[PDB]
Design an enzyme around this catalytic site. Structure first.
Site, PDB file in Angstrom:
ATOM      1  N   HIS A  61     -12.651 -26.665   3.033  1.00 51.79           N
ATOM      2  CA  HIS A  61     -13.025 -27.752   4.053  1.00 51.79           C
ATOM      3  C   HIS A  61     -12.610 -28.784   3.338  1.00 51.79           C
ATOM      4  O   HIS A  61     -12.571 -29.117   2.217  1.00 51.79           O
ATOM      5  CB  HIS A  61     -14.489 -27.648   4.375  1.00 51.79           C
ATOM      6  CG  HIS A  61     -14.661 -26.387   5.604  1.00 51.79           C
ATOM      7  ND1 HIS A  61     -15.774 -26.020   5.553  1.00 51.79           N
ATOM      8  CD2 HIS A  61     -13.875 -25.839   5.973  1.00 51.79           C
ATOM      9  CE1 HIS A  61     -15.913 -24.960   6.637  1.00 51.79           C
ATOM     10  NE2 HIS A  61     -14.556 -24.713   6.902  1.00 51.79           N
ATOM     11  N   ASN A  97     -22.174 -27.284  10.483  1.00 47.34           N
ATOM     12  CA  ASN A  97     -20.928 -26.899  10.946  1.00 47.34           C
ATOM     13  C   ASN A  97     -20.855 -25.378  10.647  1.00 47.34           C
ATOM     14  O   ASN A  97     -21.003 -25.099   9.433  1.00 47.34           O
ATOM     15  CB  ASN A  97     -19.693 -27.475  10.330  1.00 47.34           C
ATOM     16  CG  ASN A  97     -18.341 -26.690  10.572  1.00 47.34           C
ATOM     17  OD1 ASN A  97     -18.023 -26.147  11.579  1.00 47.34           O
ATOM     18  ND2 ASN A  97     -17.486 -26.456   9.611  1.00 47.34           N
TER      19      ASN A  97
HETATM   20  O1  LIG Z   1     -22.323 -28.366   7.206  1.00 52.05           O
HETATM   21  C1  LIG Z   1     -21.412 -28.956   6.437  1.00 52.05           C
HETATM   22  O2  LIG Z   1     -21.031 -28.717   5.354  1.00 52.05           O
HETATM   23  C2  LIG Z   1     -20.582 -29.917   6.956  1.00 52.05           C
HETATM   24  N1  LIG Z   1     -19.554 -30.641   6.095  1.00 52.05           N
HETATM   25  C3  LIG Z   1     -18.785 -31.643   6.726  1.00 52.05           C
HETATM   26  S1  LIG Z   1     -19.554 -32.066   8.445  1.00 52.05           S
HETATM   27  C4  LIG Z   1     -20.828 -30.745   8.453  1.00 52.05           C
HETATM   28  N2  LIG Z   1     -21.471 -30.373   9.181  1.00 52.05           N
HETATM   29  S2  LIG Z   1     -21.589 -30.922  10.634  1.00 52.05           S
HETATM   30  O3  LIG Z   1     -21.992 -32.499  10.474  1.00 52.05           O
HETATM   31  O4  LIG Z   1     -22.564 -30.278  11.440  1.00 52.05           O
HETATM   32  C5  LIG Z   1     -19.981 -30.732  11.748  1.00 52.05           C
HETATM   33  C6  LIG Z   1     -18.537 -30.570  11.225  1.00 52.05           C
HETATM   34  C7  LIG Z   1     -17.613 -30.388  12.063  1.00 52.05           C
HETATM   35  C8  LIG Z   1     -17.878 -30.609  13.663  1.00 52.05           C
HETATM   36  C9  LIG Z   1     -19.169 -30.608  14.134  1.00 52.05           C
HETATM   37  C10 LIG Z   1     -20.152 -30.715  13.131  1.00 52.05           C
HETATM   38 ZN   LIG Z   2     -17.757 -26.640   4.498  1.00 54.40          ZN
END
Ligand SMILES: O=C(O)c1ncsc1NS(=O)(=O)c1ccccc1
Ligand SMILES: [Zn+2]
Ligand SMILES: O=C(O)c1ncsc1NS(=O)(=O)c1ccccc1
Ligand SMILES: [Zn+2]
Length: 232
Positions: A85, A179
């Site tokens: 990512h 995410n």
């Molecule tokens: O969990 C992770 O490692 C993460 N990394 C970057 S962001 C995110 N988590 S996040 O804020 O929930 C999100 C991302 C993309 C789309 C929606 C929510």
């Molecule tokens: Zn990730």
């Protein structure tokens, strides 16, 4: 004293010495109107430095190298990205241009290519099966199995008993799944138990985002993942 979004302007990086020759790097990115920090690691490798993860994009990563240059003053020779990512490979091209040798598993390189993300140059062999571990200079790289992503690695600094969980490990403040689009929820707890089994001696556990803690972060993450799995 751990840096929060508070102490970090947009486009800037703070370093945090966790132990002798081990720091976290902390950056911020704006996403969907909120501001979320992100951690990586810096590990002294004799007279050079090994970087774990970018600072989430090219501008942050150029600030990270300037902040290392200013505050540690040793060259970054290699970097490893813990999964595909953008908070982990975004900034690779910056690091490459600064003469840093960028590394990831073939699994992460394949996935970063499918995603159109930046692709670390060098391949990390021997991490393709759950529970594989390989030594990389002052760290051990471990593939616990699929969790936050199918390719996620964790990093252990044996000299400091610092475990960097990356995005497979949540900070205690995170009480709901972030995410998980690319996650393997069915395997995530099993993968966390592989981390538990392998590094039961770790003293400092650094999540991909937020506050460091101890090994209670692994259970915490298991709890959160299971609660998510059981959403109705
Ligand atoms: O969990 C992770 O490692 C993460 N990394 C970057 S962001 C995110 N988590 S996040 O804020 O929930 C999100 C991302 C993309 C789309 C929606 C929510
Ligand atoms: Zn990730
Ligand atoms: O492999 C590399 O690209 C590399 N980077 C810094 S020294 C060296 N060799
Ligand atoms: Zn993340």
């Amino acid at each position: 004293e751990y840096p929060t979004v508070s102490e970090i302007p947009v486009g800037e990086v703070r370093l945090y010495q966790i132990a002798d020759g081990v720091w976290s790097h902390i950056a911020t990115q704006s996403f969907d109107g909120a501001v979320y920090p992100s951690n990586g690691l810096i590990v002294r490798d004799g007279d050079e430095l090994l970087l774990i993860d970018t600072a989430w994009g090219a501008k942050n990563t150029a600030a990270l190298l300037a902040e290392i240059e200013k505050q540690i003053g040793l060259p970054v020779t290699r970097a490893v990205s813990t999964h595909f990512h953008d908070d982990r490979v975004g900034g690779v091209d910056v690091l490459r241009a600064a003469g840093v040798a960028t590394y990831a598993s073939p699994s992460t390189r394949r996935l970063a290519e499918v995603e159109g993300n930046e692709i670390p140059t060098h391949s990390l062999e021997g991490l393709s099966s759950s529970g594989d571990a390989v030594r990389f200079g002052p760290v051990e790289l471990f593939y616990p199995g699929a969790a936050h992503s199918t390719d996620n690695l964790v990093v252990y600094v044996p000299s400091a008993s610092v475990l960097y969980g990356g995005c497979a490990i949540y900070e205690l403040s995170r009480t709901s799944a972030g995410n998980v689009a690319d996650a393997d929820l069915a395997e995530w707890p099993t993968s966390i138990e592989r981390i538990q089994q392998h590094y039961p001696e770790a003293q400092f556990v650094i999540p991909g985002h937020g506050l460091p803690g101890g090994l209670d972060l692994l259970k915490h993450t298991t709890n959160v993942v299971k609660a998510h799995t059981n959403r109705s």
